[PDB]
UniProtKB/Swiss-Prot annotation, chain A:
It comes from Saccharomyces cerevisiae (strain ATCC 204508 / S288c). It holds the Pfam family PSD13_N. Acts as a regulatory subunit of the 26S proteasome which is involved in the ATP-dependent degradation of ubiquitinated proteins. This is 26S proteasome regulatory subunit RPN9. PROSITE patterns: PCI.
Swiss-Prot record, chain B:
It comes from Saccharomyces cerevisiae (strain ATCC 204508 / S288c). One of its GO terms (biological process) is proteasome-mediated ubiquitin-dependent protein catabolic process. The chain holds residues 150 to 442 of 445 of the full protein. Present with 5710 molecules/cell in log phase SD medium. One of its GO terms (cellular component) is proteasome storage granule. This is 26S proteasome regulatory subunit RPN5. Keywords: Acetylation, Proteasome.
C-alpha cells in the first residue's frame, strides 16, 4: 500500500522545503520495509502513530533523518521514539549497535535547551546510555550482574528533579524485571502496580508494553500478596481497558477459588502448571489467611472489636486444629496485628488497626458506626448543657 | 624434641630485648612463635599480654596486611580456650577494611562468612543485626545471601526451624579453616541449639500474650524439665522476663500492669480521636465542593 510513502513524503516536504530532505531512496526504502497495514514511519507528528513496527534495517538511513528531524518538528519527538521502537521490534542486537552510535551526544552544550529523559521526551545524553544499558543487560545476563545495574539505575533516578517522569518509568520497568527474573512475585506485584500507575495517566503507551504489564500483573498477583488477594484488584485495573488479552478470566477465577479453597479449583483457576508456579506451594497458606481475615473483619461485630473465637477462625478458614495453630503463629509475625493474643484462654484478643477493603461494605458499616459515635457524643453534651 | 618450656624460655628473653628496635616484621614474628608455644602449656593469660602488645604494633606499621592476618590466627586460638565471640568478631571487623582496598574477593569472602556464622553460634542475636546491616553485606555474594536468609528465619522461628537448618546446610554449617582456627562439628551443634532455644522464647514473649506450658514443651520439642531451665536462665539474666503459674501449667509473658502506662495510653487515644476529627473535617468539606462541581 502507498500510505507510508504518501504520508512520510508529503509531511517531510511540508515541514522543510526540500534541502537534502526529501530523500527518494528513503521514500522507496521505507516503502520496501513496510507497505502492509503497519508502516515503518509516518513523519513528524505521525511518528507518534507509525515508527518501526518490524525490524528496521532502514536504520542507517534514519540516522541521516535524525540529522534532519529537529527542524521538521520539535524537542520531544526525537528522544521519544527510536530507542523503544528497536526494543518493541525485538531488535536486541541492533539496540546495542544504535547505543554505540548515539552514546551521549545529539545537540548538547551551547545548543542549549533543557533536557528530560528518553522514551517520552528529548533526554539526558547520559541517561539514555544508563537506562538502556540496564534494560538490555538484564535480559541478556545474570542476576548478580542485574543487582549491579540496578544500583546504577538507582543513582540516576536520585540525581534528578522528577519533572520529565520518563526516568521514573525507566526505574520501575528496570526494577520489575529483576523480580520477574528471580521468583519474587510479591515484590514484583508492588513494582508492577507502580509501573502501571505512572504509565497510564500520561499516555505514550504501546500495545507491546501494555501486554507485558497486564499479563505480568496477573501472574504476580496470584504468585504473591500481602494485602488481600482480589479486593484490591477491584480498585486496581487488571483489565479496565489496559488490554483484555491473555485470559484475564483468571482474576475472577481466583476470587472463586479463594472462597471455596478447592485444590481442583486451583488447577482450573489458570491452567495446571502455571497455577502451581512453584510460587503457590508457600503461597496457599498466606493467601488462605488473607480470605479468612477480611471476611471476619467486616462481619463479626459492627464496631470492629478485637475479640475472635479461635474456633470460628478455624471453621471459617477450613483447616485442622494443629495447622491453624501454625498459620496464626506465622500471621502475628507478619504484623498489622499486635496487642497480644492469649494462646491459652482461647482468646484471639489482638488489637484493631488494619485497613478495611473496598468502598462498598466499608460505607454500610460506616453509617451504622456513625449513628452510634454521634449518639454517644450527643448524650454527654445534653446532660452537660442542662445543668 | 618436646622441650616446650626450654624453647619458650630462650624465645622470651630474646623478643623483650629486641623490642622497640630491629624491624616491625621481625618483632611480630617472635610473638607468633611464642603464642604457639604458650597455648599448649596453658598459658592463655601470657598469650593475652602478648596480644595487647602485638595489636599496637600492627597498628603502628603501615603496610601490615600480612601482620594483621598472623595476629588473627593467634587470636582465635586463645579465644577457643576461653570462649568469646566478641574478641574474634571485633579484630576481624578491622581486617574487613584492609581486605577491600588491598585484596581480591577471594581473600575477603571466606572471612566475611566465617565472622557472621561465628555470630550465629553466639547466643544473643543483638550483635548479629549489626554485622548483617552492612552495605556491601546485604548485596550479593552467595554466602552473604545464605546468612541474611538465616537472619530473617530467626525472627519468624517457632523452633521447628532448627532441624530444617541443620539438614539443609552442611557447608555454612561445618565449614572452617578459612579465617579462623576451627572448631568441632559437634561443637557447632551445641551452640546452634542453645541459640535457637533462647530465640524461641524471645519471639514467643512478643507475639503471644499467653501460651500454656504443654504447648510450649511441644513447640521447642523438648522435655519440661529442660524447658523450665532454659526459661529460668533467661528470665534470671533479664534480657526478658516471663512468669510461670505452676499448677495451671501456663506461662504468663505478662501484659501492662501499671497506671503510668495506662494514663499515657489514654492520652494517646484522645490524640488519635482529635486528629480524625480534623482530617475528617477538611476531607468531607472537599468532597462537598466536587459534588457541587
Amino acid at each position: 500500500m502507498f500510505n507510508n510513502h504518501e504520508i512520510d513524503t508529503i509531511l517531510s516536504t511540508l515541514r522543510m522545503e526540500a534541502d537534502p530532505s526529501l530523500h527518494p531512496l528513503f521514500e522507496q526504502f521505507e516503502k520496501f520495509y513496510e507497505e502492509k497495514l503497519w508502516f515503518q514511519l509516518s513523519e513528524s507528528l505521525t511518528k507518534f502513530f507509525d515508527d518501526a513496527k518490524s525490524t528496521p534495517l532502514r536504520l542507517r538511513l534514519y540516522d541521516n533523518f535524525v540529522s534532519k528531524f529537529y527542524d521538521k518538528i520539535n524537542q520531544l519527538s526525537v528522544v521519544k521514539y527510536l530507542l523503544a521502537s528497536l526494543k518493541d521490534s525485538k531488535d536486541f542486537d541492533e539496540s546495542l549497535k544504535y547505543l554505540d552510535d548515539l552514546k551521549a551526544q545529539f545537540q548538547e552544550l551551547d545548543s542549549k535547551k533543557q533536557r528530560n529523559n528518553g522514551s517520552k521526551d528529548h533526554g539526558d545524553g547520559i541517561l539514555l546510555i544508563d537506562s538502556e544499558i540496564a534494560r538490555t543487560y538484564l535480559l541478556k545476563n545474570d542476576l548478580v550482574k542485574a543487582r549491579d545495574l540496578l544500583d546504577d539505575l538507582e543513582k540516576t533516578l536520585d540525581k534528578k528533579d522528577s519533572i520529565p517522569l520518563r526516568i521514573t518509568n525507566s526505574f520501575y520497568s528496570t526494577n520489575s524485571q529483576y523480580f520477574k527474573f528471580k521468583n519474587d512475585f510479591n515484590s514484583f506485584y508492588y513494582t508492577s502496580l507502580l509501573y502501571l500507575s505512572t504509565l497510564e495517566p500520561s499516555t505514550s503507551i504501546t500495545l507491546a508494553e501494555r501486554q507485558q504489564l497486564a499479563y505480568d500483573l496477573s501472574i504476580s498477583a496470584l504468585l504473591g500478596d500481602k494485602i488481600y488477594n482480589f479486593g484490591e484488584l477491584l480498585h486496581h485495573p487488571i483489565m479496565e481497558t489496559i488490554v483484555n488479552d491473555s485470559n484475564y478470566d483468571w482474576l475472577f477465577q481466583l476470587l472463586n477459588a479463594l472462597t471455596v479453597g478447592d485444590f481442583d479449583k486451583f488447577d482450573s483457576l489458570i491452567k495446571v502448571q502455571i497455577s502451581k508456579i512453584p510460587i503457590l506451594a508457600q503461597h496457599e497458606s498466606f493467601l488462605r489467611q488473607k480470605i479468612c481475615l477480611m471476611t471476619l473483619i467486616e462481619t463479626v461485630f459492627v464496631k470492629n472489636i478485637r475479640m475472635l473465637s479461635f474456633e470460628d477462625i478455624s471453621k471459617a478458614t477450613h483447616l485442622p486444629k494443629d495447622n491453624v495453630e501454625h498459620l496464626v503463629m506465622r500471621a502475628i509475625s507478619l504484623g498489622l496485628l499486635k496487642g497480644s493474643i492469649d494462646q491459652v484462654n482461647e482468646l484471639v484478643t489482638i488489637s484493631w488497626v488494619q485497613p478495611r477493603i473496598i468502598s462498598g461494605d466499608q460505607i454500610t458499616k460506616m453509617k451504622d458506626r456513625l449513628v452510634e459515635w454521634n449518639d454517644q457524643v450527643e448524650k454527654l453534651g445534653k446532660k452537660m448543657e442542662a445543668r | 624434641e618436646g622441650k616446650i618450656d626450654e624453647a619458650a624460655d630462650i624465645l622470651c628473653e630474646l623478643q623483650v630485648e629486641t623490642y622497640g628496635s630491629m624491624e616491625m616484621s621481625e618483632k611480630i614474628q617472635f610473638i607468633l612463635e611464642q603464642m604457639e608455644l604458650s597455648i599448649l602449656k596453658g598459658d592463655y593469660s601470657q598469650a593475652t599480654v602478648l596480644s595487647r602488645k602485638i595489636l599496637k604494633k600492627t597498628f603502628k606499621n603501615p603496610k601490615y596486611e600480612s601482620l594483621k592476618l598472623e595476629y588473627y590466627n593467634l587470636l582465635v586460638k586463645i579465644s577457643l580456650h576461653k570462649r568469646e565471640y566478641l574478641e574474634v568478631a571485633q579484630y576481624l571487623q578491622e581486617i574487613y577494611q584492609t581486605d577491600a582496598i588491598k585484596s581480591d574477593e577471594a581473600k575477603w569472602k571466606p572471612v566475611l562468612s566465617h565472622i557472621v556464622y561465628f555470630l550465629v553460634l553466639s547466643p544473643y542475636g543483638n550483635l548479629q543485626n549489626d554485622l548483617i546491616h552492612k552495605i556491601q553485606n546485604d548485596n550479593n555474594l552467595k554466602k552473604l545471601e545464605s546468612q541474611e536468609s538465616l537472619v530473617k528465619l530467626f525472627t519468624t522461628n517457632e523452633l521447628m526451624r532448627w532441624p530444617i537448618v541443620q539438614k539443609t546446610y552442611e557447608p555454612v554449617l561445618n565449614e572452617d579453616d578459612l579465617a579462623f582456627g576451627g572448631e568441632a562439628n559437634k561443637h557447632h551443634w551445641e551452640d546452634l541449639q542453645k541459640r535457637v532455644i533462647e530465640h524461641n522464647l524471645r519471639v514467643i514473649s512478643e507475639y503471644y500474650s499467653r501460651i500454656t506450658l504443654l504447648r510450649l514443651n511441644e513447640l521447642l520439642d523438648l522435655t519440661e524439665s529442660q524447658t523450665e531451665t532454659y526459661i529460668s536462665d533467661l528470665v534470671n539474666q533479664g534480657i526478658i522476663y516471663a512468669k510461670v503459674n505452676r499448677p495451671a501449667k501456663i506461662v504468663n509473658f505478662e501484659k501492662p500492669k501499671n497506671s503510668s502506662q495506662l494514663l499515657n495510653e489514654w492520652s494517646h487515644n484522645v490524640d488519635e480521636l482529635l486528629e480524625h476529627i480534623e482530617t475528617i473535617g477538611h476531607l468531607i468539606t472537599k468532597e462537598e465542593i466536587m459534588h457541587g462541581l
